[PDB]
Amino acid sequence: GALKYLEELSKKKQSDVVRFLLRVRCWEYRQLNVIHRASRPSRPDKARRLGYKAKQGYVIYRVRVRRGGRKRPVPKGATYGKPTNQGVNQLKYQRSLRATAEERVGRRCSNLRVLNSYWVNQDSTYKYYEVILVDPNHKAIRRDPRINWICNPVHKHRECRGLTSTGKKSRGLNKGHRFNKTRAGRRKTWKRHNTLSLWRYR
Amino acid sequence: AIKHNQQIPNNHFRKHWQRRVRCHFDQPGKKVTRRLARRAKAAALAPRPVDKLRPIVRCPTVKYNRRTRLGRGFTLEELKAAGIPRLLAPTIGIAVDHRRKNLSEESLAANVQRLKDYKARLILFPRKSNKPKKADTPKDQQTAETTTSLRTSFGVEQPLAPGFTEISKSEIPAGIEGGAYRALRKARSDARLVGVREKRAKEKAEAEA
Amino acid sequence: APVERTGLIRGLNKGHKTTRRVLKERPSRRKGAQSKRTQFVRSLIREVAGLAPYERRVIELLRNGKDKRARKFSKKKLGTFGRAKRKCEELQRIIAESRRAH
Amino acid sequence: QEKKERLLREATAIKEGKKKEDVSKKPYTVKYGLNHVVGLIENKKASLVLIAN
RNA sequence: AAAGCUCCUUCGACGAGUCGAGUAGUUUGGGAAUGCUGCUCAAAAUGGGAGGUAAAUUUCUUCUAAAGCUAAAUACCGGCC
RNA sequence: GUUGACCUCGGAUCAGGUAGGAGGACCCGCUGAACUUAAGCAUAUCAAUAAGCGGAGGAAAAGAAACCAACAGGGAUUGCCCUAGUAACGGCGAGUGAAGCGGCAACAGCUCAAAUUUGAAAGCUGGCUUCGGCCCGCGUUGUAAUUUGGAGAGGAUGCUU
Ligand SMILES: [K+]
Ligand SMILES: [K+]
Ligand SMILES: [K+]
Ligand SMILES: [K+]
Ligand SMILES: [K+]
Ligand SMILES: [K+]
Ligand SMILES: [K+]
Ligand SMILES: [K+]
Ligand SMILES: [K+]
Ligand SMILES: [K+]
Ligand SMILES: [K+]
Ligand SMILES: [K+]
Ligand SMILES: [Mg+2]
Ligand SMILES: [Mg+2]
Ligand SMILES: [Mg+2]
Ligand SMILES: [Mg+2]
Ligand SMILES: [Mg+2]
Ligand SMILES: [Mg+2]
Ligand SMILES: [Mg+2]
Ligand SMILES: [Mg+2]
Ligand SMILES: [Mg+2]
Ligand SMILES: [Mg+2]
Ligand SMILES: [Mg+2]
Ligand SMILES: [Mg+2]
Ligand SMILES: [Mg+2]
Ligand SMILES: [Mg+2]
Ligand SMILES: [Mg+2]
Ligand SMILES: [Mg+2]
Ligand SMILES: [Mg+2]
Ligand SMILES: [Mg+2]
Ligand SMILES: [Mg+2]
Ligand SMILES: [Mg+2]
Ligand SMILES: [Mg+2]
Ligand SMILES: [Mg+2]
Ligand SMILES: [Mg+2]
Ligand SMILES: [Mg+2]
Ligand SMILES: [Mg+2]
Ligand SMILES: [Mg+2]
């Protein structure tokens, strides 16, 4: 096959052939709208690895985000509290930039289900992503047991809750001693450790 | 404040604890609900037992490694030794675990015998009653007294080793050469000095030539 | 059958005696091995793509004789001492092959 | 349309009694498909390759 | 036509601006830094992660990340009884 | 020159569809205090709580190991009892604080990417239809069958389903 070579070549982001392609494409985008549709994936190997198929009901969108930190929005710089939380500048957002891209694409196409997303480009001001979506009302989708699990009503707006690959990472859903506090849900676990249980025959 | 001779108190009641208090007034009610579900489940599995066959396994720390209990499922090597295909096993009431390994001969032998005891007591009804197959019970043995627990009929017969036995005098063994206490001190001392002695021998041999 | 335990706690190969056995390796334990396909592809991609900017800098230090500099530079780029050492060996192999073929 | 005609001829032969490979001969065509052709190159079966620009 | 079992010389593809490293903020019982996120650097093929005191050298153990689905035991008197 | 393709981007009260609001006791995330305690007070505490914002169901979420361990080894996920007011954190002040093992309730396993069907895209949406199919379209920049590490592929071999 040919997608094996593409996977190897995509690792050499600092080579001459790849640096040229990234520079040219990053200019082509940023001349288009902030959110727009793509006719086909620009990374055929990466999208197929994440679940993309070439049949009716799969669509691709492209989006760019502002690529920085998060400034605390308050009138001027007053916080009206104690000195330990009066910082305004060097604070950070607890979700990823990749997550924000998925949420904004989901609102534009509100009849579709978000599957995954990947990185295509970046520069000093923006990062660029491509998002994969599936039509849950198309007949060719409801016919296939490998994908029709997404037509059920428990998967409405997965990206708004953290049920995509990037959402799982930020929640901390891994096994072992390092992920003690978040393994099964941070707020659920805190409630269990703070409950006073009284039995009948104490 | 404190005023007399007391134990220093530490009562963790400085949050809004009254928002999270779980009483159990439904303890008898939940017990009735569980028994109804077990009775319904047993009726659905009409002649079959209500459980699965488990293997015997030993606990993992220096505390508790003297005892045995039931595990999750049989290994792939145990199933092959008994002669049971891995696809057939979970459809006749046997549990399977694909990530446990046999590091010894003791555990392997114990579980292999357990499987062939079960295979001897099994009754297989044919898929179609008018066309029985040569691997099915020939229906003259289909009538017998059965069990429906599999956790009492195939439990842990003895989890601990016998605590007392008797031997004839003059057959008692002789001790270790210097005594049991001295043997323990020597074994500890050797471990603390293994690195020092190896380095000393190495530099001596290198300086020899 | 690596070794047989002594039979007492608190020793050098302490523990309860047991007849150990050797196992055939699980297919999960093959992860790091090489294969004919993955060697062929990686060879062709390196020829097409070429080198990276930090790689060229190390190549010049190595063939210029400096070695503490090349190692100290690679660690700053890659991050750890173990990865830096493996990279310098690979680039040294490229240097040798290039000036030996022709 | 050609394939449907060929399958009809083969089905008739089976019904008559003969098997296939008695009515249809070995085909010769041009190969295509990116993954299909890359494999033919590596196994050294291709004679000439034409690449779109 | 399709399916299971017993043996074997040889083969045996395995997820990248990802892991990892530095630095800033927040958080955790986690202490030369437990998790998350921003910026800079940026991999490999018996390779890679972990092995609760920072570092170099030599061994050992245990799994196989960066794609995905799935009932029961658990919570709740808001809704209808 | 004429004519015919392909790629990208548009129009239409074109044929057929789909989302918003309510509810929010319980569930999944983001954002975020001060009163109070320390007999004063800034790190700390109250609290990873109240208020604010987005998204679901009868349950949700989690889930079939890049786990625990250091043993004669256990073996997906969740909940109760115990571990334990313990290891540890802390103007080491006031205060805070888990996990492995052990018994039980309930038990269930799986599918993709990375391989040439190449002796035959074997796959699918839509329209019309005696009902048997026909027609355009999607798709080779890859739709079916086959394989998922517990393996498997390729060879032997002769029983069984
Ligand atoms: K405030
Ligand atoms: K602070
Ligand atoms: K404070
Ligand atoms: K960081
Ligand atoms: K290792
Ligand atoms: K360590
Ligand atoms: K159009
Ligand atoms: K209530
Ligand atoms: K609110
Ligand atoms: K204990
Ligand atoms: K076709
Ligand atoms: K397929
Ligand atoms: Mg299309
Ligand atoms: Mg899930
Ligand atoms: Mg996971
Ligand atoms: Mg009771
Ligand atoms: Mg390995
Ligand atoms: Mg993997
Ligand atoms: Mg915060
Ligand atoms: Mg930190
Ligand atoms: Mg219309
Ligand atoms: Mg709404
Ligand atoms: Mg109060
Ligand atoms: Mg005060
Ligand atoms: Mg006061
Ligand atoms: Mg005051
Ligand atoms: Mg609130
Ligand atoms: Mg509803
Ligand atoms: Mg329930
Ligand atoms: Mg669910
Ligand atoms: Mg697995
Ligand atoms: Mg083990
Ligand atoms: Mg478990
Ligand atoms: Mg006690
Ligand atoms: Mg306590
Ligand atoms: Mg706290
Ligand atoms: Mg098969
Ligand atoms: Mg075979």
CSV table of N, CA and C (backbone and C1' of nucleotides) in Angstrom, one decimal, chain A residues 1 39 48 53-56 72 81-85 93-94 111 138-139 143 146 153 156-157 160-161 171 173 175-177 186-188 190-193 197 199, chain F residues 8 17-18 27-32 34-36 43-45 48 54-57 61-62 65 67-68 76 79-81 98-99 112 115-116 125 138 142-145:
chain,number,residue,atom,x,y,z
A,1,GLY,N,0.8,-1.2,0.0
A,1,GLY,CA,0.0,0.0,0.0
A,1,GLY,C,0.8,1.3,0.0
A,39,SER,N,-13.4,19.8,0.9
A,39,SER,CA,-14.0,18.8,0.0
A,39,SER,C,-13.4,17.4,0.2
A,48,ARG,N,-8.0,8.4,8.1
A,48,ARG,CA,-8.4,7.0,8.0
A,48,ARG,C,-8.1,6.2,9.3
A,53,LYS,N,-14.3,7.2,6.5
A,53,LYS,CA,-14.5,6.4,5.4
A,53,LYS,C,-15.0,7.2,4.2
A,54,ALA,N,-14.8,6.7,3.0
A,54,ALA,CA,-15.1,7.4,1.8
A,54,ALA,C,-16.5,7.0,1.2
A,55,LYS,N,-17.5,7.4,2.0
A,55,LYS,CA,-18.9,7.1,1.5
A,55,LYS,C,-19.8,8.2,2.1
A,56,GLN,N,-21.0,8.2,1.5
A,56,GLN,CA,-21.9,9.3,1.8
A,56,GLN,C,-22.4,9.3,3.3
A,72,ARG,N,-8.0,36.7,32.3
A,72,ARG,CA,-9.2,36.7,33.1
A,72,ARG,C,-10.0,38.0,32.8
A,81,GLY,N,-10.8,40.5,46.2
A,81,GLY,CA,-10.7,39.3,47.1
A,81,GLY,C,-9.4,39.3,47.9
A,82,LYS,N,-8.8,38.2,48.0
A,82,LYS,CA,-7.6,38.0,48.8
A,82,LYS,C,-6.4,37.9,47.8
A,83,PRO,N,-5.2,38.3,48.3
A,83,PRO,CA,-4.1,38.4,47.3
A,83,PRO,C,-3.7,37.1,46.6
A,84,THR,N,-4.2,35.9,47.1
A,84,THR,CA,-3.7,34.7,46.4
A,84,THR,C,-4.4,34.4,45.1
A,85,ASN,N,-5.5,35.1,44.8
A,85,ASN,CA,-6.1,34.9,43.5
A,85,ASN,C,-6.4,36.3,42.8
A,93,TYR,N,-6.2,27.9,30.5
A,93,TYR,CA,-7.4,27.3,30.3
A,93,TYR,C,-7.3,25.7,30.5
A,94,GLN,N,-8.3,25.1,31.1
A,94,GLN,CA,-8.2,23.7,31.5
A,94,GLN,C,-8.5,22.8,30.4
A,111,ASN,N,-26.9,19.2,12.9
A,111,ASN,CA,-27.6,17.9,12.6
A,111,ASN,C,-26.6,16.7,12.5
A,138,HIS,N,-28.7,9.6,7.7
A,138,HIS,CA,-28.5,9.1,6.4
A,138,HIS,C,-28.7,7.5,6.4
A,139,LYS,N,-29.3,7.0,5.4
A,139,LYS,CA,-29.6,5.6,5.3
A,139,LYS,C,-28.4,4.7,5.3
A,143,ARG,N,-27.4,1.7,8.3
A,143,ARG,CA,-27.4,0.3,7.8
A,143,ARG,C,-26.1,-0.4,8.3
A,146,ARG,N,-21.0,-1.3,12.2
A,146,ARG,CA,-19.7,-0.7,12.7
A,146,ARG,C,-19.8,0.7,13.1
A,153,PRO,N,-29.6,8.0,21.0
A,153,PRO,CA,-29.7,9.4,21.6
A,153,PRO,C,-28.7,9.6,22.8
A,156,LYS,N,-25.6,12.4,21.8
A,156,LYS,CA,-25.8,13.8,21.4
A,156,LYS,C,-24.8,14.7,21.9
A,157,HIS,N,-24.1,15.4,21.0
A,157,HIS,CA,-23.1,16.4,21.4
A,157,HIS,C,-22.0,15.8,22.3
A,160,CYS,N,-19.3,18.3,23.7
A,160,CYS,CA,-19.6,19.3,24.7
A,160,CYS,C,-19.5,18.7,26.1
A,161,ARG,N,-19.4,17.4,26.3
A,161,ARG,CA,-19.2,16.7,27.5
A,161,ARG,C,-17.9,16.1,27.8
A,171,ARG,N,-9.7,15.0,31.0
A,171,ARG,CA,-10.4,14.6,32.2
A,171,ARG,C,-9.5,13.7,33.1
A,173,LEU,N,-8.6,10.1,32.4
A,173,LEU,CA,-9.2,8.8,32.4
A,173,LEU,C,-8.1,7.8,32.0
A,175,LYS,N,-5.6,4.4,34.0
A,175,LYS,CA,-5.4,3.5,35.1
A,175,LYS,C,-4.1,3.7,35.8
A,176,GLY,N,-4.1,3.4,37.1
A,176,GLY,CA,-2.9,3.4,37.9
A,176,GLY,C,-2.8,4.4,39.0
A,177,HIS,N,-1.7,4.4,39.7
A,177,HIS,CA,-1.5,5.2,40.9
A,177,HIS,C,-1.4,6.7,40.6
A,186,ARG,N,-13.8,13.0,38.7
A,186,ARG,CA,-13.2,13.8,39.8
A,186,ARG,C,-14.3,14.1,40.8
A,187,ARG,N,-15.4,14.7,40.4
A,187,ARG,CA,-16.4,15.2,41.3
A,187,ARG,C,-17.2,14.0,41.9
A,188,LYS,N,-17.4,12.9,41.2
A,188,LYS,CA,-18.0,11.7,41.8
A,188,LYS,C,-17.1,11.2,42.9
A,190,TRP,N,-14.9,12.7,44.7
A,190,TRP,CA,-14.8,13.6,45.9
A,190,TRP,C,-16.1,13.4,46.8
A,191,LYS,N,-17.2,13.2,46.1
A,191,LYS,CA,-18.5,13.0,46.9
A,191,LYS,C,-18.4,11.7,47.7
A,192,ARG,N,-17.8,10.7,47.1
A,192,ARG,CA,-17.7,9.4,47.9
A,192,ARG,C,-16.8,9.5,49.1
A,193,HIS,N,-15.7,10.2,49.0
A,193,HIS,CA,-14.8,10.4,50.1
A,193,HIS,C,-15.4,11.3,51.2
A,197,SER,N,-21.8,7.7,56.2
A,197,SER,CA,-22.8,6.7,56.1
A,197,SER,C,-23.1,6.1,57.4
A,199,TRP,N,-25.4,3.2,59.5
A,199,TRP,CA,-26.3,2.0,59.4
A,199,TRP,C,-27.2,1.9,60.5
F,8,U,P,-12.6,19.1,-5.9
F,8,U,O5',-12.7,20.6,-5.8
F,8,U,C5',-11.7,21.4,-5.1
F,8,U,C4',-11.9,22.9,-5.4
F,8,U,C3',-13.2,23.5,-4.9
F,8,U,O3',-13.1,23.9,-3.5
F,8,U,C1',-12.8,24.2,-7.1
F,17,G,P,-39.7,13.7,4.0
F,17,G,O5',-38.4,13.4,4.9
F,17,G,C5',-38.0,14.1,6.0
F,17,G,C4',-36.6,14.0,6.3
F,17,G,C3',-36.1,14.7,7.6
F,17,G,O3',-36.3,13.8,8.7
F,17,G,C1',-34.6,15.3,5.8
F,18,U,P,-37.0,14.3,10.0
F,18,U,O5',-35.8,15.0,10.9
F,18,U,C5',-34.6,14.3,11.2
F,18,U,C4',-33.5,15.2,11.5
F,18,U,C3',-33.7,16.3,12.5
F,18,U,O3',-33.4,15.9,13.8
F,18,U,C1',-32.7,17.2,10.5
F,27,C,P,-25.2,13.5,41.2
F,27,C,O5',-25.2,13.1,39.6
F,27,C,C5',-24.9,11.8,39.2
F,27,C,C4',-24.9,11.6,37.7
F,27,C,C3',-23.7,12.3,37.1
F,27,C,O3',-22.5,11.6,37.2
F,27,C,C1',-25.7,12.7,35.8
F,28,C,P,-21.1,12.4,37.2
F,28,C,O5',-20.9,13.0,35.7
F,28,C,C5',-20.6,12.1,34.6
F,28,C,C4',-20.2,12.9,33.4
F,28,C,C3',-19.2,14.0,33.6
F,28,C,O3',-17.8,13.5,33.7
F,28,C,C1',-20.9,14.8,32.2
F,29,G,P,-16.7,14.4,34.4
F,29,G,O5',-16.4,15.5,33.4
F,29,G,C5',-16.0,16.9,33.8
F,29,G,C4',-16.1,17.8,32.6
F,29,G,C3',-15.7,19.3,32.9
F,29,G,O3',-14.3,19.4,32.8
F,29,G,C1',-17.8,19.3,31.8
F,30,C,P,-13.5,20.4,33.8
F,30,C,O5',-13.9,21.9,33.3
F,30,C,C5',-13.4,22.4,32.0
F,30,C,C4',-14.1,23.7,31.7
F,30,C,C3',-13.9,24.9,32.6
F,30,C,O3',-12.7,25.5,32.3
F,30,C,C1',-16.2,24.7,32.2
F,31,U,P,-11.8,26.3,33.4
F,31,U,O5',-12.8,27.4,33.9
F,31,U,C5',-13.0,28.6,33.2
F,31,U,C4',-14.0,29.5,33.9
F,31,U,C3',-13.7,30.0,35.3
F,31,U,O3',-13.0,31.2,35.3
F,31,U,C1',-15.9,29.0,35.3
F,32,G,P,-11.9,31.5,36.5
F,32,G,O5',-12.9,31.6,37.8
F,32,G,C5',-13.4,32.8,38.2
F,32,G,C4',-14.4,32.5,39.4
F,32,G,C3',-13.7,32.2,40.7
F,32,G,O3',-13.2,33.3,41.4
F,32,G,C1',-15.5,30.7,40.3
F,34,A,P,-12.1,35.1,48.1
F,34,A,O5',-12.7,35.7,49.4
F,34,A,C5',-13.1,37.1,49.5
F,34,A,C4',-14.5,37.2,50.1
F,34,A,C3',-14.6,36.7,51.6
F,34,A,O3',-14.1,37.6,52.5
F,34,A,C1',-16.4,36.0,50.3
F,35,C,P,-13.7,37.1,54.0
F,35,C,O5',-15.1,36.8,54.7
F,35,C,C5',-15.9,37.9,55.0
F,35,C,C4',-17.3,37.5,55.5
F,35,C,C3',-17.3,36.8,56.8
F,35,C,O3',-17.2,37.6,57.9
F,35,C,C1',-18.7,35.6,55.3
F,36,U,P,-16.1,37.4,59.0
F,36,U,O5',-16.1,35.8,59.3
F,36,U,C5',-17.2,35.2,60.1
F,36,U,C4',-17.1,33.7,60.1
F,36,U,C3',-15.9,33.1,60.8
F,36,U,O3',-16.1,33.1,62.2
F,36,U,C1',-16.1,32.0,58.7
F,43,U,P,-3.4,35.1,51.6
F,43,U,O5',-2.4,33.8,51.6
F,43,U,C5',-1.3,33.8,50.8
F,43,U,C4',-0.5,32.5,51.1
F,43,U,C3',-1.2,31.2,51.3
F,43,U,O3',-1.6,30.6,50.0
F,43,U,C1',0.4,31.4,53.0
F,44,A,P,-3.1,30.0,49.9
F,44,A,O5',-3.3,29.2,51.2
F,44,A,C5',-2.8,27.8,51.4
F,44,A,C4',-3.0,27.3,52.8
F,44,A,C3',-4.5,26.9,53.1
F,44,A,O3',-4.8,25.6,52.6
F,44,A,C1',-3.6,28.2,54.8
F,45,U,P,-6.2,25.3,52.0
F,45,U,O5',-7.2,25.5,53.2
F,45,U,C5',-7.3,24.6,54.3
F,45,U,C4',-8.3,25.0,55.3
F,45,U,C3',-9.7,25.1,54.8
F,45,U,O3',-10.4,23.9,54.9
F,45,U,C1',-9.1,27.1,56.0
F,48,A,P,-12.2,20.6,49.2
F,48,A,O5',-11.9,20.2,47.7
F,48,A,C5',-13.0,20.3,46.7
F,48,A,C4',-12.7,21.5,45.8
F,48,A,C3',-13.6,21.6,44.6
F,48,A,O3',-14.9,22.1,44.8
F,48,A,C1',-11.3,22.2,44.1
F,54,G,P,-26.3,28.5,28.7
F,54,G,O5',-25.5,27.3,28.2
F,54,G,C5',-24.8,27.3,26.9
F,54,G,C4',-23.9,26.1,26.7
F,54,G,C3',-24.6,24.8,26.5
F,54,G,O3',-25.2,24.6,25.2
F,54,G,C1',-22.7,24.6,27.9
F,55,G,P,-26.4,23.6,25.1
F,55,G,O5',-25.9,22.2,25.5
F,55,G,C5',-25.2,21.4,24.6
F,55,G,C4',-24.9,20.0,25.1
F,55,G,C3',-26.1,19.2,25.4
F,55,G,O3',-26.7,18.6,24.2
F,55,G,C1',-24.6,18.9,27.2
F,56,A,P,-28.1,17.9,24.2
F,56,A,O5',-27.9,16.5,24.8
F,56,A,C5',-28.9,15.7,25.4
F,56,A,C4',-28.4,14.5,26.0
F,56,A,C3',-29.5,13.5,26.6
F,56,A,O3',-30.1,12.7,25.6
F,56,A,C1',-27.7,13.8,28.2
F,57,G,P,-31.6,12.3,25.8
F,57,G,O5',-31.6,11.1,26.9
F,57,G,C5',-30.8,9.9,26.7
F,57,G,C4',-30.8,9.1,28.0
F,57,G,C3',-32.1,8.6,28.5
F,57,G,O3',-32.5,7.4,27.8
F,57,G,C1',-30.8,9.5,30.3
F,61,A,P,-23.1,8.1,29.3
F,61,A,O5',-21.8,8.2,30.2
F,61,A,C5',-21.2,9.4,30.5
F,61,A,C4',-20.4,9.4,31.8
F,61,A,C3',-19.2,8.4,31.9
F,61,A,O3',-18.0,8.9,31.3
F,61,A,C1',-20.6,8.1,33.8
F,62,A,P,-17.1,8.0,30.4
F,62,A,O5',-16.5,6.9,31.4
F,62,A,C5',-15.6,7.2,32.4
F,62,A,C4',-15.3,6.0,33.3
F,62,A,C3',-14.8,4.8,32.5
F,62,A,O3',-13.4,4.8,32.3
F,62,A,C1',-16.5,4.2,34.0
F,65,A,P,-7.5,-5.8,28.0
F,65,A,O5',-7.0,-4.5,28.8
F,65,A,C5',-5.7,-3.9,28.6
F,65,A,C4',-5.5,-2.7,29.5
F,65,A,C3',-4.2,-2.1,29.4
F,65,A,O3',-4.3,-0.7,29.7
F,65,A,C1',-4.5,-2.9,31.6
F,67,C,P,1.0,0.3,32.8
F,67,C,O5',0.0,-0.1,33.9
F,67,C,C5',-1.1,0.8,34.3
F,67,C,C4',-2.0,0.2,35.3
F,67,C,C3',-1.4,-0.2,36.6
F,67,C,O3',-1.1,0.9,37.5
F,67,C,C1',-2.8,-1.9,35.9
F,68,C,P,0.2,0.7,38.5
F,68,C,O5',-0.3,-0.5,39.5
F,68,C,C5',-1.3,-0.3,40.4
F,68,C,C4',-1.5,-1.6,41.2
F,68,C,C3',-0.5,-2.1,42.1
F,68,C,O3',-0.5,-1.4,43.4
F,68,C,C1',-1.2,-3.9,40.9
F,76,A,P,-10.0,-8.1,36.7
F,76,A,O5',-10.3,-7.4,35.3
F,76,A,C5',-9.4,-6.6,34.7
F,76,A,C4',-10.0,-5.4,33.9
F,76,A,C3',-10.8,-4.5,34.6
F,76,A,O3',-10.1,-3.5,35.3
F,76,A,C1',-12.0,-5.1,32.7
F,79,G,P,-17.6,3.7,42.6
F,79,G,O5',-18.6,2.8,43.5
F,79,G,C5',-19.9,3.3,43.9
F,79,G,C4',-20.6,2.3,44.7
F,79,G,C3',-20.1,1.9,46.0
F,79,G,O3',-20.5,2.9,47.0
F,79,G,C1',-20.7,0.0,44.9
F,80,C,P,-19.6,3.0,48.3
F,80,C,O5',-20.0,1.8,49.2
F,80,C,C5',-21.2,1.7,49.9
F,80,C,C4',-21.4,0.4,50.7
F,80,C,C3',-20.4,0.2,51.8
F,80,C,O3',-20.7,0.9,53.0
F,80,C,C1',-20.5,-1.8,50.6
F,81,C,P,-19.6,1.5,54.0
F,81,C,O5',-18.9,0.1,54.5
F,81,C,C5',-19.5,-0.7,55.5
F,81,C,C4',-18.7,-1.9,55.9
F,81,C,C3',-17.3,-1.6,56.4
F,81,C,O3',-17.3,-1.2,57.8
F,81,C,C1',-17.2,-3.4,54.9
F,98,A,P,-9.5,11.2,51.9
F,98,A,O5',-8.9,9.7,51.8
F,98,A,C5',-9.1,9.0,50.6
F,98,A,C4',-7.9,8.9,49.7
F,98,A,C3',-7.6,7.6,49.2
F,98,A,O3',-8.4,7.2,48.1
F,98,A,C1',-5.6,8.7,49.8
F,99,A,P,-8.9,5.6,48.0
F,99,A,O5',-7.6,4.8,47.5
F,99,A,C5',-7.0,5.2,46.3
F,99,A,C4',-5.7,4.4,46.2
F,99,A,C3',-5.9,2.9,46.4
F,99,A,O3',-6.3,2.2,45.2
F,99,A,C1',-4.0,3.7,47.6
F,112,C,P,-14.2,-5.2,12.2
F,112,C,O5',-13.7,-3.8,11.8
F,112,C,C5',-12.3,-3.5,11.7
F,112,C,C4',-12.0,-2.0,11.9
F,112,C,C3',-10.8,-1.5,11.2
F,112,C,O3',-11.0,-1.1,9.9
F,112,C,C1',-10.9,-0.7,13.5
F,115,A,P,0.2,-1.6,4.9
F,115,A,O5',-0.8,-2.7,5.3
F,115,A,C5',-1.7,-3.2,4.3
F,115,A,C4',-1.1,-4.3,3.4
F,115,A,C3',-1.8,-4.7,2.2
F,115,A,O3',-0.9,-5.0,1.1
F,115,A,C1',-1.4,-6.6,3.6
F,116,U,P,-1.0,-4.2,-0.2
F,116,U,O5',-2.0,-5.0,-1.1
F,116,U,C5',-3.1,-4.3,-1.8
F,116,U,C4',-3.9,-5.2,-2.7
F,116,U,C3',-4.2,-6.6,-2.0
F,116,U,O3',-5.5,-7.0,-2.5
F,116,U,C1',-3.0,-6.9,-4.0
F,125,U,C1',-27.8,6.2,-1.2
F,125,U,C3',-29.7,5.3,-0.1
F,125,U,C4',-28.5,4.9,0.7
F,125,U,O3',-30.9,5.7,0.7
F,125,U,C5',-28.6,3.5,1.1
F,125,U,O5',-28.5,2.7,-0.1
F,125,U,P,-28.4,1.1,0.1
F,138,C,P,-21.0,10.7,-9.2
F,138,C,O5',-20.9,9.9,-7.8
F,138,C,C5',-21.3,10.5,-6.6
F,138,C,C4',-21.1,9.6,-5.4
F,138,C,C3',-19.6,9.1,-5.2
F,138,C,O3',-18.8,10.1,-4.6
F,138,C,C1',-21.2,7.3,-4.8
F,142,G,P,-8.6,6.8,-0.4
F,142,G,O5',-9.5,5.8,-1.3
F,142,G,C5',-10.9,5.9,-1.3
F,142,G,C4',-11.6,4.6,-1.3
F,142,G,C3',-11.4,3.8,0.0
F,142,G,O3',-12.6,3.0,0.3
F,142,G,C1',-10.5,2.6,-1.8
F,143,U,P,-13.1,2.9,1.8
F,143,U,O5',-14.5,2.1,1.6
F,143,U,C5',-15.7,2.8,1.5
F,143,U,C4',-16.8,2.0,0.9
F,143,U,C3',-17.0,0.6,1.4
F,143,U,O3',-17.8,0.5,2.6
F,143,U,C1',-16.8,0.4,-0.9
F,144,A,P,-17.6,-0.6,3.7
F,144,A,O5',-17.8,-2.0,2.9
F,144,A,C5',-17.3,-3.2,3.4
F,144,A,C4',-17.8,-4.4,2.6
F,144,A,C3',-17.4,-5.7,3.1
F,144,A,O3',-18.2,-6.2,4.2
F,144,A,C1',-17.3,-5.6,0.7
F,145,A,P,-17.4,-6.9,5.4
F,145,A,O5',-16.8,-8.2,4.8
F,145,A,C5',-17.5,-9.4,4.6
F,145,A,C4',-16.7,-10.5,3.9
F,145,A,C3',-15.5,-11.0,4.7
F,145,A,O3',-15.9,-12.0,5.7
F,145,A,C1',-14.9,-10.6,2.5
